[PDB]
Design a protein around this ligand. Sequence first.
Ligand SMILES: NS(=O)(=O)c1ccc(OCCCN2CCC([C@](O)(c3ccccn3)C3CCCC3)CC2)cc1
Length: 468
Amino acid sequence: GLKAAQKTLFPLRSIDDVVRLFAAELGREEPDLVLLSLVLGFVEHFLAVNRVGLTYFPVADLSIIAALYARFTAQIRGAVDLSLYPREGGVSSRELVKKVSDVIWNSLSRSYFKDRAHIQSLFSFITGTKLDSSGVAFAVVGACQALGLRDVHLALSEDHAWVVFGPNGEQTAEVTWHGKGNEDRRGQTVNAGVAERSWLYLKGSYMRCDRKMEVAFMVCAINPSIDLHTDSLELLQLQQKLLWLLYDLGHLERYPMALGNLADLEELEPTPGRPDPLTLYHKGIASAKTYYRDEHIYPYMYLAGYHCRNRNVREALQAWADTATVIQDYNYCREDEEIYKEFFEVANDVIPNLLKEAASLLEAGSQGSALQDPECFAHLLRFYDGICKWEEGSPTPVLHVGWATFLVQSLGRFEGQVRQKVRIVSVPGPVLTFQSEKMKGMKELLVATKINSSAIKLQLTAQSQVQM
Ligand SMILES: NS(=O)(=O)c1ccc(OCCCN2CCC([C@](O)(c3ccccn3)C3CCCC3)CC2)cc1
């Protein structure tokens, strides 16, 4: 409306006043996404974008929030005539959804840095005419709810956003851009992407949000960064509390990455009486396994990063091998580059630095060292096997000589007597089966006393010939 009952909690004078607002909206049949996004972008603006004047918490007076709310709703209602788009079943049509998308798109500034911080909210849309990629999709959803279109919902994969709608919520529509350069399928289904088994569309195991999960998304979208070096403590705490509130209400059940975000926040600043980060990261993984057929990559990476920051080398390598075990059943397609970059950085920067440190600490007399544990070697091998398998049948290559260099260095960190304890068995403590043809052909090289660097390179990149 706003409705009288949504107004009684104003002004919001503190973090807990914001949380109380979220609680009361989440009590409702339909939490108000426009109200809540405006409030978050407001508080984010005055705690991270401009802190001038801040003495505690930027007071969100009803007069300010209501006028922002009225601007959004007038802008949408004025520009979308619902009577031109008749609704059977209480469900929306593709043309209606496209028009709402076009409205949001056309309101945006022509040129701006599309990956700035703080352009995710309806606050940024209204005050700055700017939105990031997935912010456009959220905004389309908000606009749809404000028009009474309750079939329209946010869909998310690990790197993109679109909408679902229509009979049984079975239709999909592209409403925003993806990445740098991707030309458009705006208005189309995602079924081509699903059918080609790219990571971008998660072989169809992407998130189909209900309203509560859309609130969870805007809370994950809170960006506490003030600059490269500094975070807003007030926004970190707000985000954390909001996530716990969503957790207790059961609204993070089908949101794996939200559980990873919470775990990260708990590591930074733990809440007395709550599960530890590890429990959290494992619920994020169990959520992916239960609702998304274990087809998601980030739950394992979040866990891996935690183990990496704490120097549990063994556990970090296990998590990354689990990561690769997911990716192996995808095809590497155009538009999957963000997950290529994540794997590239693991293999070729993070793991080599972890293992270099472990080599020094071994020289310094460390026991139980990753580099003396054959299970750690097996995890490293499983990691690469999954990447190799991922590459098979993909329309674009993954591996090249730049990866081979780090592979050779990483294998060399483990002595022969440690590498030879891994048992590699065929289809048809440490025991390991390779699914990839590259790693199967490599198996003897990997356990040789002397690592044959040139042969490993040839096997990893399938380079036919050596120097004339
Ligand atoms: N090197 S590592 O330790 O293995 C590691 C690497 C990446 C990691 O990434 C964790 C961050 C994952 N991130 C969260 C924001 C998320 C997203 O950027 C986002 C943005 C806004 C709100 C919710 N999610 C997406 C969701 C789909 C569309 C945008 C994309 C995935 C963690 C660890």
